[PDB]
Design a protein around this ligand. Structure first.
Ligand SMILES: [Zn+2]
Length: 257
């Protein structure tokens, strides 16, 4: 059966999927990954800056594997220097429109939702009320490595104190965290990023534009005491940048409360 072999290769995709993928592949055939400071960045074209941010961020995440065979194969082709299929496939899964700007964080998490981690990772949250008692919520694998809604590890680990259900005060706090890396994403947040403080994070994405909208994105990496800014095929370096941060990538966690 045609349907079955397709689902095997691409996962449970909708009827329009193959036409959208193949077409995107034709459309993005002119795009190019260029070498910038010895790494690959997607050269700006057709509002594709969000894809540069997505793909350069993915390239920093060791131990990920895609559970969809076509996506894993394209991913390995990309790692080997031929990124057309991967670009077109993530645009297809993301329901992206060629030539339109799009939301890099949203797409990044849509892509990672199709991935698994090739090693153990665990995140354990403790909830406890003075009435209800205790319960632990355990996330494993790739899900333990990503979190939306905060952009610092201090915030992530901060005890939360809320209104329960019965009427007693309920508490929530991260109590164990072991990962190979940690991706935190939030809404565009103006920060002065500086390498004099020597930050804990190793990379972050930057949103340019009005913060209610889909914007334009710059990928940034920390290296050699500098911020390396990859603006869709061009690289520049700075010690200091006032910018709106969205995604922030941290090294592996090894934490117990
Ligand atoms: Zn309670």
């Amino acid at each position: 059966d045609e349907t079955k072999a397709l689902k095997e290769l691409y996962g449970p995709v909708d009827p329009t999927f193959l036409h959208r993928f193949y077409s995107l592949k034709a459309a993005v055939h002119g795009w190019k990954m260029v070498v910038c400071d010895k790494v690959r960045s997607l050269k700006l074209s057709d509002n594709n800056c969000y894809l540069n941010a997505v793909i350069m961020t993915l390239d920093l995440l060791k131990d990920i594997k895609f559970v969809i065979p076509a996506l894993q194969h394209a991913f390995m082709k990309h790692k080997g220097g031929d990124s057309t299929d991967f670009i077109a496939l993530i645009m297809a899964y993301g329901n992206c429109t060629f030539g339109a700007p799009d939301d890099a964080s949203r797409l990044l998490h849509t892509v990672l939702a199709k991935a698994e981690l090739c090693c153990s990772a665990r995140m354990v949250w403790r909830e406890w009320c003075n009435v209800c008692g205790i319960k632990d919520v355990v996330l494993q694998g790739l899900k333990a490595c990503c979190y939306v809604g905060v952009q610092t590890v201090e915030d992530l680990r901060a005890r939360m104190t809320y209104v329960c259900q019965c009427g007693g005060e309920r508490h929530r706090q991260l109590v164990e965290h072991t990962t190979p890396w940690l991706l935190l994403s939030g809404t565009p947040n103006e920060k002065l990023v500086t390498t004099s403080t020597a930050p804990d994070f190793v990379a972050f994405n930057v949103f340019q534009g009005i913060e209610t909208a889909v914007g334009h994105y710059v990928h940034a990496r920390l290296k050699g005491g500098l911020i390396l800014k990859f603006d869709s095929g061009t690289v520049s370096k700075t010690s200091d940048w006032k910018c709106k941060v969205t995604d922030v990538l941290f090294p592996g966690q090894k934490y117990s409360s």
